[PDB]
Amino acid sequence: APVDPECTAKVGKAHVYCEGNDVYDVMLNQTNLQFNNNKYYLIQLLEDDAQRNFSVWMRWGRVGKMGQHSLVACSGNLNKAKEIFQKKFLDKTKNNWEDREKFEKVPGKYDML
Amino acid sequence: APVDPECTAKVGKAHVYCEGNDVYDVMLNQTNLQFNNNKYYLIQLLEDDAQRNFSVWMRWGRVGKMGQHSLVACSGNLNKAKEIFQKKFLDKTKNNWEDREKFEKVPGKYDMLQ
DNA sequence: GCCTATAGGC
DNA sequence: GCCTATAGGC
DNA sequence: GCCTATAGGC
DNA sequence: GCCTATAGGC
């Protein structure tokens, strides 16, 4: 569970946030040669080590290409950050994150693991 | 020349960079009712207050709406940063930055303002 | 991909 | 009126 | 060959 | 919009 090296603003100073089982780091894929999809979507909830301060990192593109990315800062509001992460996970897969163990792929939606 | 408030990671820790005339802050517009374009593009070269460290901020979207944005870090390489800023200005308007007190709008490219 | 307005479906 | 899928512009 | 407009996928 | 691969004009 290393912080995405592409997140230059945090690779030195922060960790992926966890609570036992629940490690808020995940990689998504949708390959579909009918529509020429071969694309990823990474999501990471990050806490700083120095201060109690949270961020959500998202990064996406065609497999192989460094794509685009977003870093959303939450300043200690862990709930904001879990919401963003979980909402986005749902948006892209049509599965709830808490329901991760029993993941059911959907047509035209991202796949996990 | 305040830092865009939407740049949460640098509002209050940094300033728009200037050198005499040249203030590296600018807003672009392209309206074209035929194709329903009504969009902006902001660009800002920023120096940190406490250290010699530069960044380019870009932010764009439909007029009124939130949009997307990018922050490009340059460390103390001010030339990298001027390049990025100026290149991007050229990409979007078809006019060079330094020679455009006399700015000439072109069809299907962004316009400046004052 | 992003954001968000809008049309169709309860 | 509400919810979500669709696509319209960025 | 160089350079800029376009187009495809994200 | 981005990043890129290719098409097209001088």
From Swiss-Prot, chain B:
PTM summary: Auto poly-ADP-ribosylated on serine residues, leading to dissociation of the PARP2-HPF1 complex from chromatin. Poly-ADP-ribosylated by PARP1. Acetylation reduces DNA binding and enzymatic activity.
Effect of substituting residue 38 to A: Reduced recruitment to DNA damage sites. Abolished DNA-induced ADP-ribosyltransferase activity
UniProt tissue specificity: Widely expressed, mainly in actively dividing tissues. The highest levels are in the brain, heart, pancreas, skeletal muscle and testis; also detected in kidney, liver, lung, placenta, ovary and spleen; levels are low in leukocytes, colon, small intestine, prostate and thymus.
Impact reported for residue 39 to A: Decreased poly [ADP-ribose] polymerase activity
Stretches assigned to the WGR domain: 13-110
Annotated effect of mutating residue 60 to A: Decreased poly [ADP-ribose] polymerase activity. Impaired formation of a complex with damaged DNA
Phenotypic consequence of residue 110 to A: Reduced DNA-induced ADP-ribosyltransferase activity
Effect of residue 92 to A: Decreased poly [ADP-ribose] polymerase activity. Impaired formation of a complex with damaged DNA
Subcellular location: Nucleus; Chromosome
Mutagenesis / variant outcome for changing residue 41 to F: Decreased poly [ADP-ribose] polymerase activity
Record family assignment: Belongs to the ARTD/PARP family.
The protein's assembly and partners: Component of a base excision repair (BER) complex, containing at least XRCC1, PARP1, POLB and LRIG3. Homo- and heterodimer with PARP1. Interacts (via the PARP catalytic domain) with HPF1. Interacts with core nucleosomes.
Entry's free-text remark on domains: The N-terminal region (NTR) recognizes and binds poly-ADP-ribose chains produced by PARP1, leading to its recruitment to DNA damage sites. The N-terminal disordered region does not act as a key DNA-binding domain. The WGR and PARP catalytic domains function together to recruit PARP2 to sites of DNA breaks. The N-terminal disordered region is only required for activation on specific types of DNA damage.
Biological role: Poly-ADP-ribosyltransferase that mediates poly-ADP-ribosylation of proteins and plays a key role in DNA repair. Mediates glutamate, aspartate or serine ADP-ribosylation of proteins: the ADP-D-ribosyl group of NAD(+) is transferred to the acceptor carboxyl group of target residues and further ADP-ribosyl groups are transferred to the 2'-position of the terminal adenosine moiety, building up a polymer with an average chain length of 20-30 units. Serine ADP-ribosylation of proteins constitutes the primary form of ADP-ribosylation of proteins in response to DNA damage.
UniProt protein name: Poly [ADP-ribose] polymerase 2
Naturally occurring in which organism (per UniProt): Homo sapiens
Gene name in the database record: PARP2
Full-length numbering of the shown residues: 92 to 205 of 583
